[model samples]
Target chain A: GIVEQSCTSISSLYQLENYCN
Target chain B: FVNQHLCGSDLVEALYLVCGERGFFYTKPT
Candidate 1:
């Protein structure tokens, strides 16, 4: 599924990167 | 015009509005 635009943000990006670690 | 940024809302955004280091800017949401 495509990610919602609302979920796209600096905070969200940081969280995603953290999860990958 | 006599000045704004009042109930007019300043219309100012963070220096890194959308997040950048080039310099200050504004946010253009979609």
Candidate 2:
């Protein structure tokens, strides 16, 4: 569960950065 | 058994105690 949440958060951060760019 | 044991194992186990895998359950008593 921790790994799943960590991966999901990382993916969300990357998506957020892409949107900002 | 001891008087100190009265509070219950739940206090000693807490939440993170699940990581112990001591008996697959959270509250094994002494």
For the second chain of model 1, what is the TM-score against the true structure's chain B? 0.17
DockQ winner among the candidates?
A: 1
lDDT of 1 by residue, A1-21 (tens): 112443233333222232221
- Candidate 2 global TM-score: 0.16
User: Which CAPRI category fits model 2?
Assistant: incorrect
| DockQ of the two-chain complex in candidate 1 | 0.04
The i-RMS of candidate 2 is: 19.8
For every model in order, the TM-score on chain A comes to 0.19, 0.19
Native contacts present in candidate 1, fraction: 0.00
> What TM-score would chain B of candidate 2 score versus the native chain B?
0.22
lDDT digits (tens) for residues B1-30 of candidate 1: 123222111122222333334543233435
- The Cα error of candidate 2 at residue A12, in Å, is 0.8
